Design a binder for this molecule. Structure first.
Ligand code: GDP
Ligand code: MG
Length: 166
């Protein structure tokens, strides 16, 4: 409870949420019995221990699970694919949706452009991701979950952001 961070992955189908979540996990004694699509890992960030509870239960078709995700997170990773415009536009919709669900809280958010390895398929530019993050007042990163590029920096980044709002 200060050492602990509940982090929620949201985004359109096929953007890479589950692939991100799997890289994050892999290998004790947190109080929480993990359910559905929940992962726990304890991380060292800036010389301080961080227990992350990661939720990856956002699907596009349990309808209440959307409202659940939007309510329980301390922090959010709003994921789109650089090779998919509509997922990028969806990300803005989800950010607005999240802001309405949490009107009075300063929620740490990272906007994540996944699939950066798919160079010839890029449809969304780095500048667009950046400009969008500026409009949203959140952070931005591009990852490739397939090759584990910037995935470490991402989860360090989100812990770093939630600590700044204390
Ligand atoms: N090339 C590439 N493929 C990816 C990346 N991340 C995920 N994928 C692929 O995209 C497909 C759907 O990914 P998934 O993680 O299930 O998306 P989800 O719906 O958001 O959970 C899978 O076949 C993954 O192999 C990435 O960074 N690069
Ligand atoms: Mg998934």
């Amino acid at each position: 409870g200060n050492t602990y961070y509940r982090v929620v992955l949201i985004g359109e189908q096929g953007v890479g949420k589950s692939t991100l979540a799997n890289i994050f996990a892999g290998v004790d004694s947190d109080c929480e019995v993990l359910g559905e699509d929940t992962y726990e890992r304890t991380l060292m960030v800036d010389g301080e221990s961080a227990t992350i509870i990661l939720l990856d239960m956002w699907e596009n078709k349990n309808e209440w699970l959307h409202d659940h995700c939007m309510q329980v997170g301390d922090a959010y990773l709003i994921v789109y694919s650089i090779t998919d415009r509509a997922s990028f536009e969806k990300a803005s919709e989800l950010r607005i949706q999240l802001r309405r669900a949490r009107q009075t809280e300063d929620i740490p958010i990272i906007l994540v452009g996944n699939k950066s390895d798919l160079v010839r398929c890029r449809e969304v530019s780095v500048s667009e991701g950046r400009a969008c993050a500026v409009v949203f007042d959140c952070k931005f990163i591009e990852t490739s979950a397939a090759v584990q590029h910037n995935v470490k920096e991402l989860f360090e980044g989100i812990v770093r952001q939630v600590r700044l709002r204390r």
